[PDB]
A paper describes a structure:
Crystal structures of THAS (here referred to as THAS1), a second representative THAS (Cr_021691, THAS2) and the structure of the promiscuous homologue (Cr_032583b, HYS) were solved and mutants revealed key residues that control the stereochemistry of the product profiles. The active site cavities of the HYSs are framed by helix α2, the catalytic zinc coordination sphere, and loops 1 and 2, with the NADP(H) co-substrate binding at the base of the active site.
Structures were obtained for THAS1 and THAS2 with NADP+ bound (THAS1, 1.05 Å resolution; THAS2, 2.10 Å resolution) and in apo form (THAS1, 2.25 Å resolution; THAS2, 2.05 Å resolution), while HYS could only be crystallized in the apo form (2.25 Å resolution). The proximal zinc of THAS1 is ∼2 Å further away from the cofactor relative to SAD and thus may play no direct role in catalysis. However, it may have a function in maintaining the tertiary structure since three of the liganding residues are in the substrate-binding domain and the fourth is in the cofactor-binding domain. SAD/CAD utilize an active site serine that protonates the alkoxide that results from reduction of the aldehyde substrate; this serine is replaced with a tyrosine residue in THAS1 (Tyr56) and HYS (Tyr53). Interestingly, a non-proline cis-peptide is present in the THAS1-NADP+ and HYS apo structures. Closer inspection of this region in THAS1 shows that when this bond is in the trans conformation, the side chain of Asp340 is projected into the cofactor-binding site such that it would prevent NADPH binding. In silico docking with THAS1 positions cathenamine between the nicotinamide of the NADP+ and Tyr56, which is located on helix α2. THAS1 loop 1 contains Phe65 that also projects into the active site and may interact with the aromatic cathenamine substrate.
Numbering used by the authors:
A (entry chain B), B (entry chain A): 12 to 355
The structure:
Amino acid sequence: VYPVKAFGLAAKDSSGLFSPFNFSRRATGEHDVQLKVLYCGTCQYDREMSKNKFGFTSYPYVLGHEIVGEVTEVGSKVQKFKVGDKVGVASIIETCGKCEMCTNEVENYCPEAGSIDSNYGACSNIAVINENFVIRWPENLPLDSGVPLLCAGITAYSPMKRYGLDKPGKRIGIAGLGGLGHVALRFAKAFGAKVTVISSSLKKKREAFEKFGADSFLVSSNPEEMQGAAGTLDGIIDTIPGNHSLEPLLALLKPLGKLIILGAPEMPFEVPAPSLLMGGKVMAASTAGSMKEIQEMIEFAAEHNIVADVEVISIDYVNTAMERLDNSDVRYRFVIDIGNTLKS
Amino acid sequence: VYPVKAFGLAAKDSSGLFSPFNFSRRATGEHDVQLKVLYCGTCQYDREMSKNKFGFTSYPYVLGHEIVGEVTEVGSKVQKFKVGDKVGVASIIETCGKCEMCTNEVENYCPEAGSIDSNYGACSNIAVINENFVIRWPENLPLDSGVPLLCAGITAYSPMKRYGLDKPGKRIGIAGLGGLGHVALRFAKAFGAKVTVISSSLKKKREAFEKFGADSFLVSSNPEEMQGAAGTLDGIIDTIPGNHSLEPLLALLKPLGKLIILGAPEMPFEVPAPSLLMGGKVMAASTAGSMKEIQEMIEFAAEHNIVADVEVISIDYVNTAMERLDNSDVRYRFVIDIGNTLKS
Ligand SMILES: NC(=O)c1ccc[n+]([C@@H]2O[C@H](COP(=O)([O-])OP(=O)(O)OC[C@H]3O[C@@H](n4cnc5c(N)ncnc54)[C@H](OP(=O)(O)O)[C@@H]3O)[C@@H](O)[C@H]2O)c1
Ligand SMILES: NC(=O)c1ccc[n+]([C@@H]2O[C@H](COP(=O)([O-])OP(=O)(O)OC[C@H]3O[C@@H](n4cnc5c(N)ncnc54)[C@H](OP(=O)(O)O)[C@@H]3O)[C@@H](O)[C@H]2O)c1
Ligand SMILES: [Zn+2]
Ligand SMILES: [Zn+2]
Ligand SMILES: [Zn+2]
Ligand SMILES: [Zn+2]
C-alpha cells in the first residue's frame, strides 16, 4: 500500500519455499532512515519462521531481521544519520514507547514490540526504519562478517550482561556450537571466561580448540565425558534449536549456576524439581536485546574484533541455505549479499 | 555411639509413625554448643521425609530441623555463646568448610552439607552443634512463634535477597498460602511489596486479606481470575509441594520477572520454551540459606516483628499433627513445646 518500490524474497506458505516478491515501503517520514540493504544475515530463526514452527507466522513472510546497509535518505527531523552512513538494524524496529519496559530502556521486552519481519523483513533492496532503532556501524567492523552481531551478538550479549556471565575467570559452557553459539563463545572469551563447548559430536572438536580457543569440549552423547564435568560450570548458554533435555546441562552447573535458554524447541522441557533444587540453580530465557545494549555490544565487538564466521551467499542460493539449516550445515552463519546479487 | 544421653521421637519406617526413641550426642568439643531444646518447629518437610517422599530418608528418622533452645555447656574455645543464652539452629549444621560454596559464605550449597535431621534431628531433649551453625536468639522475637523463621523464614528470605524480590513497591506473588507461604508473605510485606496470593481455592481468601493484608487473591483453577492478572508480577514465591504446572505462574510475571521454586513435587515440571522466552523470564530454585543470611534474616524479622502463626503442641500430639499436615490443616505451623512436654 505504500509509495516506495521494494523487492526481495518471500514465503507464500509453511513449506518455507522462498520466491521473488514485490512489495512497498512507506515514504521516509520525518524521523525515518531509508537505507540500501548491503548484507542480510540469515539464520535458523528464518528457517523456523518460514515453516511456521512457532505458530505465529503471517504469510507472505519476507525474511530478514539482521541487516547492514547504507543510508539513502533521512527524514527532515533526523540529525544522527546522514546519506552514506553505514548502519545496522536488528529485529525490533517499533515499540509502544510508554510502558515500563520502554521507559527503562529494555524496550525489546515491550509487550507491543514490533519485529522488523512482522511487516516485511529486510531481505530486500531497501528498508525504512525509525532512527531510534538504527545504529551507526563501527568503522572497524566488517559489514559481511559483522552483520550477524545484530542477531547472534545481541542475543548472547544481553543475557550475559544481565545475568553476570561476563566476568573473567569464570567457567562458561556453550551448548550447541552453531550460529548463535560460536558468537556467544567469542563474547565469553573476550570477557575472559574459560569456555567449555558442549556439542552433539566430535566433528567440531578441532574447530572448538583451533578456531575458537575452547578450554574443553564435551560430547553430549558420551556419558563419561558429561559425568566427568558435573558441577563445574558457572553458567551455560543453551543455543540448541531442537528437542532436548535440560537435565544434562543443569548437571554441569555448580550450585547457584545459571542456564540461559536462547534456543526455541517445539517440545516442552521436562524439568524434575530436584534438577533445580539441588544446588539452587537458575534457568533464564532471553530474547534479542535493547537498543542501549546493541550499542554497547557493537562497541565491545569493535574493540575486541568480534565477528561471525560467515558464508556469503547469493539471493538465488537462499532456498539451498534454508535446506542446509535443517542440519545446521554451515560454518557458521549465512549472509546474503544483497548489494551484489539482488536483481534490480 | 556417644556419651551424652538423648531422647526424642523417631519414625521407624515409611508409614511415618513417630514413637519415643533413645539415642546419644557427642560430648561438647572445643567449638561446640550443647543446648536444651525448648521449641521444635515442624512442617510439611518432616511429614514428607517421614514417609520417604524423596527416596532418601534413612530410618530411624528423628525429626527436628528448626529449633530454639538454651545453652547448657560451651566448649573451651567458644566465646560467642554462654550458658543460659537463648539460641536458634536451622537445618544445616556441618559443611566441608573448604569448597567454593563454603569459602564464599553460601555453605548451605556445599555439596557435602550435613542436615541436622540426617544424624538425628532435634525433636529431642538436647542438641550439640558447632558454634558456627548457631545464632543468638533476639530477645524481641518470641521463641514459640519465632522458631519457624529458622525454616520458613530463611527459605524465603535467602532467594528474596539473592534475586532482588526485596524492594518496595514491587508486586510479589505467593503461591500456596501454607506454612512457608504465610511467612514469605510477611517478609514481602515488610520489604514494602504489594502481595498477590495464588491459592488452590477460595477457602483462604478471608485470611489472606484480613490476617495478612494481601492486595489481591487469585484462585489458580479459575481461568478468568488468572488471566486478569497476566503480566503483573515482578516475582513469585512458589511453595506448592504437590504436582502443578508452572505455566500459569510464568504467565503472571512481567517480562524479566522471576519465579522462585521452593516447593518440591514428584511429577516433573513441563516447561514450554515460549513460557520463558516470551518476556525473558527466570525460574530459580532455592534451598535453605547460609548462616550469614540467617543472621540478617533474624535481625530483619526482629526489627519488623515478623513471626509465624503457630499452633503450639505437645510431644503427645505429634502424630495427630502429622496427619493434619496431609491437608495442610493448621494456621499455619505446628511448634512442639519440648521444654514443657517432652517428659524427663
Ligand atoms: N532468544 C533469541 O532472541 C533468539 C535469537 C535468535 C535465534 N534464536 C533461536 O536460537 C536457536 C538456535 O539458532 P542458531 O542460529 O544458533 O541455530 P544453528 O546455527 O542451527 O546452531 C544450533 C546448534 O545446536 C546444535 N543442535 C542443533 N539441533 C540440535 C538438536 N536437535 N539436538 C542437539 N543439538 C542440536 C548444533 O550444535 P553442535 O553441532 O555443536 O551439536 C547446532 O550447530 C533457534 O531455535 C533460534 O530460533 C533465539
Ligand atoms: N526449598 C527449601 O529449602 C524448602 C524448605 C522447607 C520446605 N520446603 C518444601 O516446601 C514445600 C511446602 O512446605 P510448606 O511447609 O509450606 O507446606 P504446607 O504448609 O503444606 O503448605 C503448602 C501449601 O501449598 C498449597 N498446596 C498444597 N498441595 C497443593 C497441590 N497439590 N496443588 C496446589 N497447591 C497445593 C496449599 O496452599 P493453598 O491452600 O493456599 O492452596 C498449602 O497450604 C514442601 O514441599 C517442603 O518440602 C522446601
Ligand atoms: Zn537471525
Ligand atoms: Zn512499551
Ligand atoms: Zn521445617
Ligand atoms: Zn563445602
